[PDB]
Amino acid sequence: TPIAGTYEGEYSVIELEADSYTTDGWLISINGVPSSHIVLGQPQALEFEYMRWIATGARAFIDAHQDASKLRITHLGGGACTMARYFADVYPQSRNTVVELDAELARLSREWFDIPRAPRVKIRVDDARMVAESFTPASRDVIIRDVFAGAITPQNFTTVEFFEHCHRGLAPGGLYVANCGDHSDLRGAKSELAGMMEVFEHVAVIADPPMLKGRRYGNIILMGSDTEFFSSNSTEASAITRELLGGGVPAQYKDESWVRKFASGAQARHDGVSTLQMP
Numbered sequence: 196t197p198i199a200g201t202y203e204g205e206y207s208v209i210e211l212e213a214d215s216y217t218t219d220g221w222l223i224s225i226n227g228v229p230s231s232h233i234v235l236g237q238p239q240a241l242e243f244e245y246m247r248w249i250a251t252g253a254r255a256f257i258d259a260h261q262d263a264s265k266l267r268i269t270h271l272g273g274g275a276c277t278m279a280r281y282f283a284d285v286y287p288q289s290r291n292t293v294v295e296l297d298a299e300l301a302r303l304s305r306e307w308f309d310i311p312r313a314p315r316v317k318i319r320v321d322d323a324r325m326v327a328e329s330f331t332p333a334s335r336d337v338i339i340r341d342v343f344a345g346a347i348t349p350q351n352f353t354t355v356e357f358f359e360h361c362h363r364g365l366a367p368g369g370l371y372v373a374n375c376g377d378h379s380d381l382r383g384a385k386s387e388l389a390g391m392m393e394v395f396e397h398v399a400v401i402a403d404p405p406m407l408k409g410r411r412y413g414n415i416i417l418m419g420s421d422t423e424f425f426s427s428n429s430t431e432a433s434a435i436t437r438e439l440l441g442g443g444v445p446a447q448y449k450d451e452s453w454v455r456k457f458a459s460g461a462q463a464r465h466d467g468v469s470t471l472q473m474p
Contacts, residue, residue: 196235197221197307204299211307223275223308225300228345230274235309238284244444245374245414246278248401249339251438252416252448254285255431256370257337260422264288267335269364271323271352272296272342276304276316283315290314292335294323324351330364338365340373347376353387356466358394358419368422371395375417379409385461387417388454393463395419400449400457401439407447426450 196219202209207225214220219235232242241247257263266289270279279291293316295301301318310316319326323342338361342352351357361371371391377383391398399418406413418424425431427450439446449457 202299202303204297206297207300209300209303221308225274225345230344231277231308233275233277233280233309238280238309241277241281243277244403244442244446245344245416246281247442248414248416248439248446249278249341249372249374250281250285251435252399252401252418253282253337253339253370253372255425255435256418256420256422257286259425259431260368261336261370266290266337268292268337268339269335270294271327271338271340272344273339274341274344275300275308276310276318277308278339278341279316280308280310283311287315290317292317292319294319294321294326296320296322324349324357327357327360327364330360332363333366334364335369336366337370337372340371344374345376347383348373348387350464351466353383353390354464354466355390355393358390362394368420370422371419373417375415376412377406377415378412379406381407381415382461384415384417385458386464388458389461390463391417391419392455392458396421397423397451398454399424399451400454401435402447402449403444404447405444424451427453 197211199211199213210224212222221233223231234240263286266286268282268291270293273293276293279293283291298320301320375384397420401416403413405411435448
């Protein structure tokens, strides 16, 4: 069992709180921001809406297009390794590699956050941008980006150069999926999409409707692949939709045609010029 309290991470303060009502339920917060929720022994139980959305969009794609018995999923970030733990249970032959910045969060995840052994879930303590730059061709089938959840994504995870590294690492036709937090101008999400469209042939999104409506900050799941995404009037899209209506916040699947209009006019981002200073 986890022990409730405050833990000093390498890059963050980590707080573990036991659910009052759920046996073996645990909330994990990072720098005061709720970041994951788990129920021990129930690796498919998710409480974070955007995690449910990633699960729905990624499973629809994997089920339609990929071979689960040999699936390789790279998680660039991911609070408590919970998404990795989820996919490891849904796809019991999958190999999930989580690249985590914080050595102490990595250690707590292995000890207390109820993950299966490596290679089903394998943690690498490293800078995720640097790991992406070293991807070799066709070395993974899915990449899930979930860095610093709750914050606007660091710029180096949003550029054409980053997406090009991800594209090289993906098996032909593989899936890129990102959690993007944005406030209601949506300039961040739209610029990420603009960069993704230079790199991947196809894009789709799963969106929080009150954020699209400018009511609040929210999450949008950005998907890119050289494989076509389902169209809005398909039976697969209806199945995705029924799942998206099952959470506490009903969400919407938007197909490539919608995304190209949504992000029209947005400018892709590029890595900044080098600002390295030498002694």
